């Protein structure tokens with residue numbers, strides 16, 4: 233006899249509580265709009281009516297992405313995940329963005345479902361206040377059977393977030409294996425690994441961790457599809473991706489892109505000993521054909537009223553597509569990156585003396601900090617809400633003083649593991665950089681010219697290693713984020729800076745009509 237489990241899954245929803253446009257920015261024309269929690273509820277309930285054994289899972293990164301999270305700070309996540317009746321959630325890196333206190337009080341205390349992470353260990357005074365609010369695993373009854381769900385979270389979280397000194401992030405495979413063994417001793421033969429470390433780590437967990445039957449993932453925003461994909465997203469593999477484990481088993485691995493646009497849907501046929509016989513399915517595109525649930529929509533509309541206080545009024549126009557996509561901004565020069573850096577430099581114009589045209593000419597911006605495009609095809613209108621999707625973190629753009637050697641090392645770090653779609657890839661202003669990706673990590677920056685400061689005519693000259701340059705960058709990078717530890721450790725000065733969205737808003741308002749280009753700021757030999 234066979235037992236079929238239906239795994240429903242989301243990952244990297246990123247405050248997209250409402251429905252969105254095709255590129256996950258604000259919904260304009262509702263006929264061509266997608267996702268949101270109300271539409272998700274409808275599809276989940278169809279499948280719960282139709283299929284006997286159903287789990288709705290989240291693989292982290294609900295926190296952070298839109299004005300919803302700016303205002304409600306995770307209370308919206310707790311409320312609407314409770315309304316959808318999620319069966320479990322794994323902690324992502326962005327769940328620690330407002331500290332451990334910003335995780336506990338909004339999300340963990342208000343959640344009426346298990347929140348999971350096995351590789352996070354509390355220390356000192358936190359252990360008491362946090363104990364039981366997150367777990368390493370959960371055994372869940374599904375029909376007659378039980379299904380174990382073991383949690384995991386990225387080891388990189390302290391480089392990406394504010395977990396603080398009282399949490400330790402263990403290796404995933406090291407931490408997961410004891411907990412999966414413990415589930416075997418409790419007669420749990422069906423074990424799902426739900427977590428937030430990326431597709432490559434998902435494949436490694438599937439390969440190495442004995443007992444794990446399915447891996448449900450996030451963080452890398454991985455779209456997988458079997459057959460013709462139903463929208464703009466390009467699949468990185470078949471759904472599910474089959475990893476062959478070290479003990480001979482076929483382990484399906486799944487991810488459901490991002491932004492609540494798709495609902496993941498995998499049907500696993502298990503045998504009586506909890507071995508995967510087969511598995512099939514695809515991520516279901518949550519298009520306008522699927523209606524929003526009236527009661528959830530009405531409740532979204534209630535929480536929406538506070539957000540309509542944000543000004544409707546046009547900040548300015550764009551006549552170009554502002555390419556703030558990850559596929560551009562983490563791999564090459566993107567025009568959204570140029571815009572933001574030009575805005576940053578424009579903000580710091582203080583023409584004080586005859587020697588310098590301006591004291592700062594230079595900008596670096598982590599590409600992973602650019603979180604949305606802005607589409608030009610609604611009369612070119614840019615609103616604050618559109619910019620809030622690009623820059624959702626409530627950060628500042630700060631001035632630092634760096635040695636050229638420190639800057640060189642940052643640009644080496646920018647491409648040290650190029651190809652993985654990680655956020656450390658640097659968008660720039662007043663810097664022309666050339667990479668050679670054939671060369672070894674730490675030796676890929678072949679040309680690095682910078683715009684002169686001590687000059688009346690701005691022009692590009694080679695970066696000198698022992699010269700000190702003033703650079704505008706995000707506070708995230710000033711505090712050593714994205715593994716830019718050389719910046720925090722070697723910086724000579726660090727001033728407080730202006731709020732990130734306001735800087736870019738001011739520039740767009742001053743310029744009125746914008747048309748930023750890709751100009752060869754970043755080249756590859």
Ligand SMILES: COC[C@](CO)(OC[C@H]1O[C@@H](n2ncc3c(NC4CCCC4)nc(Cl)nc32)[C@H](O)[C@@H]1O)P(=O)(O)O
Pocket residue numbers: 244293325326329330392393394430450451452453598599600601625627653654655656706708714
């Ligand atoms: C493998 O990609 C993972 C991911 C994909 O979308 O992107 C990671 C990239 O996101 C950027 N990031 N993360 C945090 C942060 C931040 N502020 C922090 C401190 C306080 C508030 C959080 N500020 C700025 Cl400007 N960027 C920030 C950074 O580039 C990082 O690699 P995911 O969102 O799944 O983690």
Ligand SMILES: [Ca+2]
Pocket residue numbers: 421422423443444445505506507508
């Ligand atoms: Ca099993």
Ligand SMILES: [Zn+2]
Pocket residue numbers: 244246293451
């Ligand atoms: Zn994410």
Ligand SMILES: [Zn+2]
Pocket residue numbers: 293324325326428450451452
């Ligand atoms: Zn993440």
